[PDB]
């Protein structure tokens, strides 16, 4: 849909938390392994994300994720308001499992899975589609 | 110059290390605050960066930064080889100083400075130029 929409959710693996951001229009992913599911971690992740892409609106499958004072502060400062996402998360979880034995740390496997996901042609890749969608929206 | 060239360097502030990546052709920046200047931190940062952008070659002002087994492993797996950068780092350091009192954590000020830097029109911004350069290179 719109090029400024991102969906953010956390998933749990090996007793750790993976924050996954999906650019809904392209299927492109950004992810980080965080110690715990806290408002401060979500707020910091949003500031990083908003500095890289033109983030207009955020969606989530857990609304209570965005109630903290810290998350509201990050969205205020950055000027952020509010099958694809389910499929992109499914694909990422599958890829982590496929590459997991190749690294010691879960965070390393997660970044290998993000790379594989973003570079896979579906014909363009999610990495190619996001830059095309954003560049076209500017011009 | 070429759209796949990035320059990576560390800078020191308040007893912490900031890893700064500059996309040479656009002036776009990605940065993270790391505990210490280690090969494992550089390797992990490179895996994240390479998953987001088409990273072909890496430059640095300190060649010894890339000698560790971990950095060479990240470049091998991701298929990475090897006034603008000086100006982009100068501007970032100036912006951190300007916004520093607005946040408790240096990492928060750093991400606010990256956002401000990438969104500032110079007429396009570094954030707009990187997506235009990469989208044009694909098509
Ligand atoms: C933790 C870690 N160590 C690594 C390496 C590579 C060498 N070493 C040293 C080493 C030496 C002897 C060993 F017996 C041993 F098991 C590992 C990667 C690493 C770095 C980059 C990378 C990959 C690996 C495995 C896999 C493909 C994608 O890119 C690691 C790695 O951790 C950091 C990325 C944090 C450095 C990991 O989680 O295994
Ligand atoms: C650590 C931190 N705490 C924050 C907040 C916001 C509210 N609080 C709670 C709070 C309550 C009462 C206070 F007296 C007090 F000082 C702070 C930001 C924060 C979050 C987002 C953000 C900004 C701030 C200050 C500045 C503009 C860009 O976006 C922080 C913040 O740390 C995290 C980003 C890790 C949450 C910080 O470093 O100050
Ligand atoms: C996004 As979950 C905390
Ligand atoms: C709080 As968010 C939009
Ligand atoms: C890039 As410095 C360690
Ligand atoms: C080691 As790097 C190219």
Author numbering:
A (entry chain A), B (entry chain A): 56 to 137, 149 to 188, 193 to 209
Give passages from the manuscript.
During the early steps of HIV infection, IN catalyzes the initial covalent attachment of the viral cDNA to host cell nuclear DNA. The catalytic core domain (residues 50–212) adopts an RNase H superfamily fold and contains a D,D-35-E motif that binds Mg2+ or Mn2+ ions, which mediate DNA cleaving and joining. IN function is assisted by the cellular cofactor lens epithelium-derived growth factor (LEDGF/p75), which binds tightly to a site at the catalytic core domain dimer interface. An additional class of IN inhibitors, the allosteric inhibitors of integrase (ALLINIs), act at a second site on HIV IN.
To investigate the mechanism of GSK002 resistance further, we determined three high-resolution crystal structures, one of GSK002 bound to catalytic core domain-only, one of GSK002 bound to the catalytic core domain containing the Ala124 substitution, and one of GSK002 bound to the catalytic core domain with Thr125. These two substitutions were chosen for study because they were the most influential in reducing GSK002 IC50 in the study of diverse HIV isolates. The protein structures were quite similar, with RMSDs ranging from 0.09 to 0.13 Å in pairwise comparisons. Substitutions at residue 124 could affect ALLINI binding or the catalytic core domain–CTD interaction. Overlay of the catalytic core domain•GSK002 structures on the IN•GSK1264 structure suggests a further mechanism of resistance. Larger substitutions at residue 124 and 125 would create a steric clash with the polypeptide backbone of the IN CTD, disrupting the inhibitor-mediated interaction. Thus, the larger side chains in the resistance substitutions appear to either clash directly with the IN CTD or displace the bound inhibitor sufficiently to result in an inhibitor clash with the CTD.
